[PDB]
Amino acid sequence: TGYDLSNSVFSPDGRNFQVEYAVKAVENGTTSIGIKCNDGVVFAVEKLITSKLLVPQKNVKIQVVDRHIGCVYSGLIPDGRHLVNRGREEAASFKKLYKTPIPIPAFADRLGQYVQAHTLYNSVRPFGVSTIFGGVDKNGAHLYMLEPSGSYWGYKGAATGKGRQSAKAELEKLVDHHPEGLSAREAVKQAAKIIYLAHEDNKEKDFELEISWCSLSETNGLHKFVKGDLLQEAIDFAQKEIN
Amino acid sequence: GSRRYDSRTTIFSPEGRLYQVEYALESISHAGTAIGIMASDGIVLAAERKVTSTLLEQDTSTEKLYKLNDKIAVAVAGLTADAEILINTARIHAQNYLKTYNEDIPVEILVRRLSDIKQGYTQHGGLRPFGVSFIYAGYDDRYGYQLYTSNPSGNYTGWKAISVGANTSAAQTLLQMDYKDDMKVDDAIELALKTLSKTTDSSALTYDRLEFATIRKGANDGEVYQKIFKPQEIKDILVKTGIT
Amino acid sequence: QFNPYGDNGGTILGIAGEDFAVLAGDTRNITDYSINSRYEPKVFDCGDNIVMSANGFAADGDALVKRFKNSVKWYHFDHNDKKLSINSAARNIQHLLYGKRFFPYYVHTII
Amino acid sequence: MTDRYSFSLTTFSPSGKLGQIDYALTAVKQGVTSLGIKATNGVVIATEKKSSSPLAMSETLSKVSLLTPDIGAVYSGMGPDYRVLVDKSRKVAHTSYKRIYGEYPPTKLLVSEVAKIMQEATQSGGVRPFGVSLLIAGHDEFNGFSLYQVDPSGSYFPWKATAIGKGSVAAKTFLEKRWNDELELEDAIHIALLTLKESVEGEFNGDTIELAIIGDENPDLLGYTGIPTDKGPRFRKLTSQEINDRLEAL
Amino acid sequence: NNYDGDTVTFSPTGRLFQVEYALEAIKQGSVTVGLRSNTHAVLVALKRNADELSSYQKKIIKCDEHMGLSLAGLAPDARVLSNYLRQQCNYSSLVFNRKLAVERAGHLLCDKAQKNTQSYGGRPYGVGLLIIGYDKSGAHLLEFQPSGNVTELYGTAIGARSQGAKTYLERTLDTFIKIDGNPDELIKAGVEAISQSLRDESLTVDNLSIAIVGKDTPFTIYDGEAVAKYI
Amino acid sequence: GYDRHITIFSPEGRLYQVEYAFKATNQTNINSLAVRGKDCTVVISQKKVPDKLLDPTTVSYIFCISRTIGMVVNGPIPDARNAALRAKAEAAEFRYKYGYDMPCDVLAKRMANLSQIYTQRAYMRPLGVILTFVSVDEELGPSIYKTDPAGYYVGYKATATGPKQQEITTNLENHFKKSKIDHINEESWEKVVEFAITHMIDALGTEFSKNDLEVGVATKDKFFTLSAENIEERLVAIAEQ
Amino acid sequence: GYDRALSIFSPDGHIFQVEYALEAVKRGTCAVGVKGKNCVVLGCERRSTLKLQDTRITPSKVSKIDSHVVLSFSGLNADSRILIEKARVEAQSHRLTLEDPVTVEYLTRYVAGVQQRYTQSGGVRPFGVSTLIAGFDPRDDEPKLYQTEPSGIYSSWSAQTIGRNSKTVREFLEKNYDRKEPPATVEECVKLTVRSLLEVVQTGAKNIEITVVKPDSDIVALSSEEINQYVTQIEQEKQE
Amino acid sequence: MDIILGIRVQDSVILASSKAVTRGISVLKDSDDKTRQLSPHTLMSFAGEAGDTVQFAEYIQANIQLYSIREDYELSPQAVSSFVRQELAKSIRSRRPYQVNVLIGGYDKKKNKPELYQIDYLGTKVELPYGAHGYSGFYTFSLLDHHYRPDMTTEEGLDLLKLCVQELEKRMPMDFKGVIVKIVDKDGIRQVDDF
Amino acid sequence: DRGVSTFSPEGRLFQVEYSLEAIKLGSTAIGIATKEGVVLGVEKRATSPLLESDSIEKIVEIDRHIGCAMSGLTADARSMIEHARTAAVTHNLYYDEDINVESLTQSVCDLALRFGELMSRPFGVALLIAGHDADDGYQLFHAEPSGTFYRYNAKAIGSGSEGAQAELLNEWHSSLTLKEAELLVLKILKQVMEEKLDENNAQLSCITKQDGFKIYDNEKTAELIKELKEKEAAE
């Protein structure tokens, strides 16, 4: 056989094993989530505190695209940065020509088509990240999750990395008991909790919480990081809910 | 990446042989035999068709013998399609020479350039070599009548009589035996046919499995004529030399 | 039609003593009959004890001094922090200017 | 990204076979039977329209294609390969002939160009050979009527009559029995239909048989009048109705 | 094993073996320590000689007046990466009259190393770098690695037996983080860290390389006689 | 056998990568079906939203290529979108170059040619998708044209694609043997949609709620997809029948 | 274009494509060059499983590069034509720019550079050829003889041989060539050149070629007759 | 530059070319050889734009010498002339055209015929019994029309040339410092050492 | 087979490491650095006595102040020497000065690693680059196909190098005169040379600040050889 040694080769299953191997490196990664809310989206990630030498607050992983789109990912971090760089060129180009900032579904496909292009040839390796992203546009809020095959969908909430199942379990609960909506501020607390919860599947090292959000009311449709009193407030909320 | 699927067509064996050249020659050894014989007053080209079906259009076909210019022709043994690529190249090359110097191209110069193109495919580019050997028959005012062969290696040599394709070891023995230097074209014609008659893998040699051509001075005073024999003209020559 | 050059005026002057040297330049910057600035320096310390002024078209003058200051910085990197001698600076600048032989820096240069 | 396969995928094996040409020919052997017969006053090419689904409309799938007003093509083997070859074949008639001489190429030379394209897929980097054999029927003023077969190797041969694909061995034998050099076009059409009845399993009628001719000039098919020396295409596709007429008298 | 012939191939468990082998060259390389206070950042590097008759390989390279790094692994790869960084510092200066933020220098190295890990016929960089600088937001230390992973730290160490110094700094953290406005004391704590990674040999005078950058201190390298003070 | 990794011939004259690309076509476990009315062309595909976290509105395999052309894909979504964007680009270029809307069959041919190239050139893999193109063409009327990873294409009276495709196919052939005609003899698209769903139910042995389907309709001068409510209305009409 | 590194190092530090190119040289017809006091002689075996050969027109194994410089070779004939062309081109270019014909060392250095370049460029195999380049620098009466080989290494030789059984004829030249006393005339040198080939050749019939090069572009190819005398004189001086 | 002539007599071609090289109001040189031997039995004289003349001649010369070596054979004058014409015909539609006019005087050994070819910088070739480039022609053509005979000896050819040069020294405005004369016959190329 | 730019599991480039083996098969090259000059000496190793040994050019001038010796696949050196000379003259053109010995060496070693899938393989030759500049006086550099260059007080490369380096490790002290260093190179060569050392099969060269890079002709070397036996016999 040997169908898995080269990207873009179809196996007899109809599968591309290199993309499936890419997924393992993603599944190996730190946990990260995203939550759709009334008028925005919230993003959050687990950052393993490798050592005490890591300057706290200073290895930021959530990356902004344009002024209105947040992107977080689990897997090979350099691969993630590469994808955002591309995304930023796409939003720059789209704005340059059409004047309006790039709508989220529009942006979703730009990343989707690019990632998918890295499953088309054997001279490239597929991306080693699943990417949670989105924001606010002229039609409202949108959250997307994109995978190494280039597959993506719109999500009510999403998670990837080591704690994806614990995270997905907690996300399904939110979805069921809040069918009329969840406020942007609420989603920031819930996000904190779910990262603390999903950190159990990954708990040799203790971790640093990092949140961001775009809300049409709270941040005016722009991407800002959660800091100071609001960060600590959600850190405390999550600390309650683990005991 | 893609390296994994690369045959490496242009490398040496441990014995210093070009695999693909060796295998092209092995391919060429199953082709219809072609024979060139050079006389003091002209050149003969005779080639055997890959076994014809009764329904093939005999006269309108050209499988073996091609015209390069008015003064030069080639007999082919190998893949026909490969041969055609090289022939159109040779024809153009003869026209560039005429355009540049206002003189017909010297036979060797054309031969050398075709052999140089073949050579290239065995040294660079990673493509398969041309599965073709030519017998060149032609004339120019420096060396007169000339016969050459080239093969997939890009090597070329001159001949008084020579064969390519199938059974060339058998054919070269029979040519070596009966060829004389004083020989006239009409005897060379007879030799060519008698030689194919013996080496053929067919039960009998008939007109409809032959391509035949001569280059003589047999027109008007020191000017050269190429003759690609029609079916009937070969059929007559077959009877006059007593092979049918 | 676009004219890519201009004249920013001013004047410069250099003199060599036995163990010292000067490079003087007025600080006036003009175009046509207007003053742009009464104090716009055009004589620069370029490191390694070299001072330089490219007088004429200001945009070109700044471009050259910038590139020479960058040349000096790279000379240090590529040649183990060696000091750039005035003669070697002189020759370097010849190549900077002649590089644009067919669309010159309109400047009179003194180091 | 981009093509990094700049080496040949067809190479000589130690026996001197070209593996990929051999295997393309095997693809042609599997293909549905097609044939051509040359009469004194025209040429017929024919094949079976073996429909994939009955829900398919097999008239939207033309196995017999006009290349020029006086030249037509048919194949056995892989359909998609044929379809692009037809596209390239039509265009090369224009770029490398009609745009130069102001007339359509003669059959042997259009064939020669097609053969060239097919030879290049046998030696160029990063491609496989074309998995089809073509029968090209055509007319031109100085050569008259002609019929050519073109193989994956790039080779071509002129034929009085022949067949390719599935039942080609049997079909050629049957064509040898019947072919003479005094056949009138209608005689060749009749023979073509008989020969094609051999290698057709199910239904045999005007909707399952594709048949075109290179025959007389058709001014009624030209589209305009007034230039007396333009007299219209010699390539005509027989209609479903027309085929069935000859099946009653079969 | 079957999936280590190139950078463009993932293992069944989702690893990139050519990147891991690239990481291995750092492990073989001579040790280098980096650490910082609020006012300065220091690089200490152990230089390795070929034999008794050879110079000791340079480990520290200046990038701008305010930035520099130390290397462990393939030296030419560090030359390429440092050169690229020198250009990005340059570009920032000539275009924006702006000294390049150490954080951006980090991101730019990461993306440059990354291209080599995703495309055919290339190879990962075979070197590890520690970047110190003093920009508009104080003193910084960065750890680069040829996977692309850049890391901001108070202190760290890479190369042969680096684990010793890396634990010591982790112990010393609260002491050295506050050596503010003292150059010599940050250097000696760096020298102490590197000593945790020595075996059957200690710091001689042409063996040891130290660099410092800080508030009113250009990035400058101390070598030979000018490090005798610190052994 | 590296003849099983790239698109070169095997000893029996086959392209295994093309064959394995056909296998990927069914990974989504979705069946699609298209029929022609007198005035319209309807294309229905099953809709399956497994995870509860998904936004069900973004889960679609029907695409709006042009104003007049719609396309349903059977195969993985990344390849599906690659084919969608490309077809959109080609339909827009055609309109600009030639001054009329690209016909369904022509777009089908062009995409088929593109697919063919991947079967011949080694560096391009085939896309693991089957593309069913629908419109009411201005010359040919209601049209269905389908493309596969072989680069094959043909027009259909009606068609189906997916795992349970053979059942849907024979179900439709049975209807047309009986009905004796080329299409659904029905005035409005609403009743052609009902027919399409009704015969999908019979053939699959399953019922559908409004969220289990996704419907595309092409009339003269536009193609559009039905909302959940449009289908509910359609399903209710079927109920009382 | 085609990129592959065909010439690469193996774990033992050998480049197998260069070494296999040397095997092709081994299999090529023999060639020897011997330089006299006042001349250089080039001799070449001609393989003899071929009659019907038209030697009027078949490529001569010794080629003039310029009118004062000749090159012969052993190995692939096709490869040799490419080197000979570039060498001829460079010869004329050196005349055009330096206003002086090439020295023999320069011409050798160039041809050697070509061979070497083909040892470390992607998509090409090395030349399956070694050469003997011989002639006289302009306005210089001292004879020159150089060897090149597929790797690109080159050097000067008092006398030297390449190709099949060159080990045998090198053996002969090594004990029959006195450095202290080169063959003092053309006559003597030709004899030692033919004698050496006769260890390996066969009959000296259509089997030995000789070219003599004297100073000031004075090159003359010998003919059957003249060669044949040296052959008969060598054999009747053998009966001891 | 300015003056280059050629006369083809019975058994030779005779080329006369002025020795002066002038820039501004200075005769820089008075012994210039405006000729290159292309092959042993073919000579080319040249005139026109400074720099282009020599560069062209030497480029042509190099190509013919290469050909000779490659094929161990001398191109016929007709073939050299066609090669040169084509090179000039290329140059005229180039970015910066060669501004050089030439005369090619050659003895064809196969035909045993002398041949004179006149080619201008546009690549306009003609075979002539006598030819000239520049203002020279305006005097010499009519002079030769009257005095030239097809069967003249080489000595008579040189005397015909003396007539041409006398006339040019009488009526031409510029001082061209005499000519250098060269004969091309069956025995190759030689130069007359006083004229 | 497998990519030319592949890392081994030990973290080394296969193709580089293999080139290093090829260099070990090369003829011996030794250089020694003193306050009076740098000496460069080599084994000529003529493969047969019919080869004219003076045509074996393994010591080579780069500029007047920089010389170079080679060991390994010596044909691979031609382009390295050509780049070096170009770089040295070019630098002088841009800066009206002599290029530094280290800078020149850095320039040469930049070539080394630019191979892959640029040239197709690394160089199979090591170079001893010896010169003098005003900044750091006399210098000897060992330039490898890894793209790494080391400075040495003394160095041996080629087949006799492990034996020669151990010999150099004892014999070098920081006040060697030029004379002593010439004799030292001659002495260590004769030890590791398969055949017996004479003026024909070994070659000496030095570079001094005063007279620049000179290759010694066989007369002068034959006297240093005669000189060498006399010191040796007399202990």
From Swiss-Prot, chain A:
The alpha and beta forms are probably products of the same gene with different post-translational modifications. GO terms for cellular component: nucleus; proteasome complex; proteasome core complex, alpha-subunit complex; proteasome storage granule. The keyword Cytoplasm applies. Disulfide bonds: none annotated. Keywords: Acetylation, Cytoplasm, Nucleus, Proteasome. Its main location: cytoplasm. One of its GO terms (molecular function) is mRNA binding. GO terms for biological process: proteasomal ubiquitin-independent protein catabolic process; proteasome-mediated ubiquitin-dependent protein catabolic process. It is found in: Cytoplasm; Nucleus. Transmembrane segments: none annotated. Present with 12000 molecules/cell in log phase SD medium. The 26S proteasome consists of a 20S proteasome core and two 19S regulatory subunits. The 20S proteasome core is composed of 28 subunits that are arranged in four stacked rings, resulting in a barrel-shaped structure. The two end rings are each formed by seven alpha subunits, and the two central rings are each formed by seven beta subunits. The catalytic chamber with the active sites is on the inside of the barrel. Belongs to the peptidase T1A family. This is Probable proteasome subunit alpha type-7. It comes from Saccharomyces cerevisiae (strain ATCC 204508 / S288c). The lineage of its organism: Eukaryota, Fungi, Dikarya, Ascomycota, Saccharomycotina. The gene is PRE10. The chain holds residues 6 to 248 of 288 of the full protein.
Swiss-Prot record, chain B:
GO terms for biological process: proteasomal ubiquitin-independent protein catabolic process; proteasome core complex assembly; proteasome-mediated ubiquitin-dependent protein catabolic process. It is found in: Cytoplasm; Nucleus. It holds the Pfam family Proteasome. CDD domains: proteasome_alpha_type_4. The keyword Nucleus applies. GO terms for cellular component: cytosol; nucleus; proteasome complex; proteasome core complex, alpha-subunit complex; proteasome storage granule. The 26S proteasome consists of a 20S proteasome core and two 19S regulatory subunits. The 20S proteasome core is composed of 28 subunits that are arranged in four stacked rings, resulting in a barrel-shaped structure. The two end rings are each formed by seven alpha subunits, and the two central rings are each formed by seven beta subunits. The catalytic chamber with the active sites is on the inside of the barrel. This is Proteasome subunit alpha type-3.
From Swiss-Prot, chain C:
It is found in: Cytoplasm; Nucleus. Non-catalytic component of the proteasome which degrades poly-ubiquitinated proteins in the cytoplasm and in the nucleus. It is essential for the regulated turnover of proteins and for the removal of misfolded proteins. The proteasome is a multicatalytic proteinase complex that is characterized by its ability to cleave peptides with Arg, Phe, Tyr, Leu, and Glu adjacent to the leaving group at neutral or slightly basic pH. It has an ATP-dependent proteolytic activity. Belongs to the peptidase T1B family. The 26S proteasome consists of a 20S proteasome core and two 19S regulatory subunits. The 20S proteasome core is composed of 28 subunits that are arranged in four stacked rings, resulting in a barrel-shaped structure. The two end rings are each formed by seven alpha subunits, and the two central rings are each formed by seven beta subunits. The catalytic chamber with the active sites is on the inside of the barrel. This is Proteasome subunit beta type-6. The gene is PRE7. The chain holds residues 20 to 130 of 241 of the full protein.
Swiss-Prot record, chain H:
One of its GO terms (molecular function) is endopeptidase activator activity. The modification Phosphoserine is found at residue 76. Pfam families: Proteasome. Gene3D superfamilies: Glutamine Phosphoribosylpyrophosphate, subunit 1, domain 1. Signal peptide: none annotated. Its main location: cytoplasm. GO terms for biological process: proteasomal ubiquitin-independent protein catabolic process; proteasome-mediated ubiquitin-dependent protein catabolic process. It is found in: Cytoplasm; Nucleus. Keywords: Acetylation, Cytoplasm, Nucleus, Phosphoprotein, Proteasome. One of its GO terms (cellular component) is proteasome core complex, beta-subunit complex. The modification N-acetylmethionine is found at residue 1. Belongs to the peptidase T1B family. Present with 21800 molecules/cell in log phase SD medium. Non-catalytic component of the proteasome which degrades poly-ubiquitinated proteins in the cytoplasm and in the nucleus. It is essential for the regulated turnover of proteins and for the removal of misfolded proteins. The proteasome is a multicatalytic proteinase complex that is characterized by its ability to cleave peptides with Arg, Phe, Tyr, Leu, and Glu adjacent to the leaving group at neutral or slightly basic pH. It has an ATP-dependent proteolytic activity. This subunit has a chymotrypsin-like activity. This is Proteasome subunit beta type-4. It comes from Saccharomyces cerevisiae (strain ATCC 204508 / S288c). The gene is PRE1.
